[PDB]
């Protein structure tokens, strides 16, 4: 699924923390 809408409301650090959770 698309992640853009989620990442648009997260900080850069929160974004990378989410992305690293999903790896």
């Amino acid at each position, epitope marked *: 699924m698309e992640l853009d809408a989620i990442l*648009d409301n997260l900080s850069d650090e929160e974004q990378i923390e989410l992305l690293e959770l999903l*790896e």
Partner: antibody
Amino acid sequence: EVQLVESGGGLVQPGGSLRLSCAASGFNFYSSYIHWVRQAPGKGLEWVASISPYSGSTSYADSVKGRFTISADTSKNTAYLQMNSLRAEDTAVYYCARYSWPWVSYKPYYGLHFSAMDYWGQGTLVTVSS
Amino acid sequence: DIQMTQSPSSLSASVGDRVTITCRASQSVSSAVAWYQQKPGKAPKLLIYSASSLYSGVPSRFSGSRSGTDFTLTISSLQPEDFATYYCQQSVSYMGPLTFGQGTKVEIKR
């Protein structure tokens, strides 16, 4: 097929303005991110700006903040880069390019997938000179 | 900001050789790394996306791998038409700054 055609480049005196346009043909423009990426003669690639054409959200490189404005018309499937206060260091070939949406997706059992610039226009040359 | 340090700035190799180009991200960029090939006077062409996925239509000798913040473009069997400048590019910041990496000029040795 998929095409990006750039227009509006040319010679302009220091401090002047130019407006680049990028007409997109064979793909959903509402479902894309548009980027302007420039290359000064003999130098590397430098990202300039990004836009999501439907929501109009934009991002700029620090080198151009306040001077450049990226915009898009979803009716004409055309993105635009309005460049003000041009300096010699702005001299470059300006490329239009595209991310197909989404920027990043996640699929269970397969992981993350990040979009990349798969379609680029041929470029338009901007020369800032007296 | 987030820097892509692309080593060797240039290299020369013979037809058929295996060539590797490296890109170190100054911090985590996940797999948000693309590899482009640019021939003179032309727009860059996408080779690798999402750090390891071969773009459709690209010859199989191009491949990308990731280990942490190190990204490797491998050309396993160098062809004369591979003369070009190659660039990595990160996109880990959603609608944030995209940075490239200085490029690698690949000359063909004959």
